[PDB]
Amino acid sequence: PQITLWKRPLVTIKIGGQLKEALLDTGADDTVIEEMSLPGRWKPKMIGGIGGFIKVRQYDQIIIEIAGHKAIGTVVVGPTPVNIIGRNLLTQIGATLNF
Amino acid sequence: PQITLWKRPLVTIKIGGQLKEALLDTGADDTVIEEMSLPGRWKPKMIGGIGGFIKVRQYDQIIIEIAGHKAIGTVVVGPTPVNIIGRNLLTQIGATLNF
Numbered sequence: 712p713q714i715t716l717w718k719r720p721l722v723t724i725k726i727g728g729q730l731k732e733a734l735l736d737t738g739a740d741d742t743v744i745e746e747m748s749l750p751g752r753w754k755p756k757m758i759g760g761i762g763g764f765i766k767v768r769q770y771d772q773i774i775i776e777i778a779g780h781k782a783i784g785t786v787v788v789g790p791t792p793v794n795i796i797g798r799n800l801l802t803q804i805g806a807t808l809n810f
Numbered sequence: 811p812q813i814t815l816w817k818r819p820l821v822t823i824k825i826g827g828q829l830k831e832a833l834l835d836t837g838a839d840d841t842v843i844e845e846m847s848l849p850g851r852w853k854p855k856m857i858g859g860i861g862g863f864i865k866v867r868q869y870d871q872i873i874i875e876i877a878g879h880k881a882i883g884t885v886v887v888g889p890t891p892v893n894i895i896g897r898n899l900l901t902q903i904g905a906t907l908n909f
């Protein structure tokens with residue numbers, strides 16, 4: 712699809728068999744998800760946003776469907792205003808920014 | 811142009827007579843610029859992101875040139891770690907996400 716930006720670019724994602732809403736964010740290096748249970752081990756990470764840094768749990772090789780496109784990659788879990796799909800998975804689904 | 815997202819989508823902007831680097835951010839409602847002076851009236855605002863909120867100065871009817879395309883709209887100025895072009899100006903230059 713072609714998504715215009717007059718409204719927030721929110722899509723449906725599926726992770727751990729659950730449907731959730733997430734924001735497509737070309738400004739984010741990483742994919743940040745609200746508190747939930749994921750399988751496997753996690754590693755520590757600090758990420759920066761406009762209001763300062765947060766500590767997150769980094770899970771690698773997680774299966775996630777984004778707007779109907781399959782991705783398998785790193786997701787970080789932490790305090791976030793919204794679920795955010797960042798460039799690490801936007802590249803997996805072939806997304807580009809065009810103008 | 812067509813911008814892949816393997817790297818951060820940074821472009822040159824012109825604002826207030828100055829050339830700067832800025833991040834094209836489909837996840838940001840607003841355009842947030844690091845501290846600088848702009849002409850005209852402003853009012854205080856709080857904007858929230860990852861990390862929490864920051865206090866900014868809101869200037870309306872500011873013109874920006876973004877990768878050579880002119881746009882006008884509201885710009886907020888404050889202690890952001892990076893200059894961000896948000897949806898309010900991305901729409902004006904016809905930017906879309908495609909996959």
Ligand SMILES: CCC[C@@]1(CCc2ccccc2)CC(O)=C([C@H](CC)c2cccc(NS(=O)(=O)c3ccc(C(F)(F)F)cn3)c2)C(=O)O1
Binds near residue numbers: 743839841892896
């Ligand atoms: C995962 C971190 C993402 C990011 C990184 C910024 C950055 C980049 C390079 C280096 C350092 C830091 C980019 C980003 O879009 C925001 C947020 C949106 C998630 C952001 C950006 C700009 C302004 C706002 N505030 S707001 O009032 O315009 C706003 C508030 C909330 C939302 C909502 F959709 F997230 F809810 C969107 N916009 C927020 C952010 O806080 O940091």
Ligand SMILES: [Cl-]
Binds near residue numbers: 884898
């Ligand atoms: Cl505006």
Ligand SMILES: [Cl-]
Binds near residue numbers: 715904
């Ligand atoms: Cl349009």
Ligand code: NA
Binds near residue numbers: 850851869872
């Ligand atoms: Na003004």
